[PDB]
């Protein structure tokens, strides 16, 4: 119904952006996260979303693992950017 | 003239209705627009205030925008950056 976060308004961190996480390469999710904040803050969203250990899933960013600890800013994420999640049950 | 004191900004609501607002230069326009939202009933999030030809940010300031006490804040509802 509602949609916040600067629709493509990534300037200089501390200006929250929407983060898209693609899980199991079957669909996508759109998270809203600033940047300077570790991605591990985001990596659990998907979980609370799909029911994932958070630590068990595997995320990625345009050419980066973004090992949660990685903050979007540090890596240079953007609004609506995506972070692919690939984690089997094995 | 004006360094870090107040300055009046004219915010236009796309419909041709602009408003005057004194906002201290080094102050985030988020206040001036907050008054605009106050003036009517906008959301301030669904709104994007553009400065005389210059996308605006809640944190953007007249100084930061080289405005003055005789400039104009342009208003646009959702379209600019954040």
């Amino acid at each position: 119904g509602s949609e916040e976060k600067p629709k493509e308004g990534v300037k200089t961190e501390n200006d929250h952006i929407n983060l898209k996480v693609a899980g199991q390469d079957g669909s996508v999710v759109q998270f809203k996260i600033k940047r300077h904040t570790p991605l591990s803050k985001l990596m659990k969203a998907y979980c609370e979303r799909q029911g994932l250990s958070m630590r068990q899933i595997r995320f990625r960013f345009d050419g980066q693992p973004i090992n949660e600890t990685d903050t979007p800013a540090q890596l240079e994420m953007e609004d609506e950017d995506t972070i692919d999640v690939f984690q089997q049950q094995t | 003239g004006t360094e870090n004191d107040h300055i009046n900004l004219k915010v236009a609501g796309q419909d041709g209705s602009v408003v005057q607002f004194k906002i201290k230069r080094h102050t985030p326009l988020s206040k001036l627009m907050k008054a605009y939202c106050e003036r009517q009933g906008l959301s301030m999030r669904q709104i994007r205030f553009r400065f005389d030809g210059q996308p605006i940010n809640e944190t953007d300031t007249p100084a930061q925008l080289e405005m003055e006490d005789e400039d104009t804040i342009d208003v646009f509802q959702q379209q600019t950056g954040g």
Binding site: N18, K34 | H6, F21, K24, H26, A35, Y36, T61
Partner: peptide
């Protein structure tokens, strides 16, 4: 997606100098 997004990040904005409001409109 359909649904909010929890995460809670650092601050959002900073105000160096203060100021009041006005009427008009």
């Amino acid at each position: 997606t359909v649904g909010d997004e929890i995460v809670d990040l650092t601050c959002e904005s900073l105000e160096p100098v203060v100021v009041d409001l006005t009427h008009n409109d």
